[PDB]
Design a protein around this ligand. Structure first.
Ligand SMILES: [Ca+2]
Ligand SMILES: [Ca+2]
Ligand SMILES: [Ca+2]
Ligand SMILES: [Ca+2]
Lengths: 87, 146, 87, 146
């Protein structure tokens, strides 16, 4: 029997959250790189602006990943419950 | 990820754990109820996402054949040794790898659903391998999962 | 400057959720072990009952862990924002 | 995890990003507003937990000295190479390690906050190292994070 074993861990809403935030990670990574490495004189205010936007986009992608991990474990919960009937 | 005849009938018993009114369909509302009976708290969007993940005909509810695709895709199981160890470690006050028999009794007779002092007798009898009144929970969990 | 670097990732409510569910993981692990390995005749209905309770407790601990990861990244978001002012 | 004089003044500027009304205190409500301006959606309990984590005097709000303990405890930063790579990989349709210049233009001129076709010119000029009209995003991200 399955004993103490449980289901192995391997949306449109999340999908668009991901693509907007990912584009923004590309956008701000580029703009921080340009403004810290390809300019004669570094405009710190500009860098600060894009660092805010950069962290916002990185953390949005993190929030999506964590929500997908939560969703996956919720589905695993259903499957683990269904699987009790195999006993 | 292909299934058998005995499992189909068994997963049919499973479907009834979810289809609380028996109309042959599982709604977000029914899924909420079940998930909450398992001490979880999915939001509305989470419930819809779980349905949406396996809703072929896209009619907003899970039917029995959609229920079996969820299952086929996920039959693989995994050993729970490490996670169970981490649950014991919650009660390892000094993080020394041990929980005394007295502390285990305290935990088990007061927290969660609880065991009776007698059930705890049997549990400690198995857990206290060395008879030193201390439970090496890593070793104990490995015995129960072997 | 910090450029593209961000804060490194290393409650009473959650606390009691953890202790109740952890105790229940101990409880059901024991009762499944006893009923599948220390009995003459395996009572499958009993095993099924404790497997339901076991998965419920394991998944509750998972939900707590994921919530703590979410909380930690929220705090890291605040710190990353505060840190833009170092630029 | 000890801090300097310049950083204290700087973290004072930081405090004003959060203390929207300036009463020298950050409430759950003010934290919500800020976290939402960063495109996040913490629940009430999450906001209270963040305050509670660093609320010494336990009066329910974060003051500036409580704000510096959050910071002292967390000054260490980490390289973002891998996470940035994963963001590019969102647009790698075949998962082959490349995004064409044309696809990058499409993404960047239509999604998120967007760049102008001219900003994209400069970005692609840097990204298309080999001048083959294709961006090896792993290599490009490593150049920008070096
Ligand atoms: Ca129904
Ligand atoms: Ca359906
Ligand atoms: Ca205030
Ligand atoms: Ca306070």
């Amino acid at each position: 029997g399955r004993k103490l074993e449980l289901t192995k861990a391997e949306d449109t809403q999340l999908t668009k959250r991901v693509k907007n935030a990912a584009a923004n990670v590309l956008r701000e990574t580029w703009l921080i790189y340009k403004n810290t490495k390809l300019v004669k004189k570094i405009d710190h205010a500009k860098v600060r602006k894009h660092q805010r936007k950069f962290l916002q986009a990185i953390h949005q992608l993190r929030s999506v990943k964590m929500e997908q991990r939560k969703l996956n474990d919720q589905a695993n919960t259903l499957v683990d419950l269904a699987k009790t009937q195999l006993e | 990820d292909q299934l058998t005849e005995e499992q189909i009938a068994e997963f049919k018993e499973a479907f009834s754990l979810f289809d609380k009114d028996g109309d042959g369909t599982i709604t977000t509302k029914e899924l909420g109820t079940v998930m909450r009976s398992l001490g979880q708290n999915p939001t509305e969007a989470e419930l819809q996402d779980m349905i949406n993940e396996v809703d072929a005909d896209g009619n907003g509810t899970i039917d029995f054949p959609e229920f079996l695709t969820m299952m086929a895709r996920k039959m693989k199981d995994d050993d729970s040794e490490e996670e169970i160890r981490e649950a014991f470690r919650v009660f390892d006050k000094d993080g020394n790898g041990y929980i005394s028999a007295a502390e285990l009794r305290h935990v088990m007779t007061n927290l969660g659903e609880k065991l009776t002092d007698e059930e705890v007798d049997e549990m400690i009898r198995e857990a206290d391998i060395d008879g030193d009144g201390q439970v090496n929970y890593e070793e104990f969990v490995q015995m129960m999962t072997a």
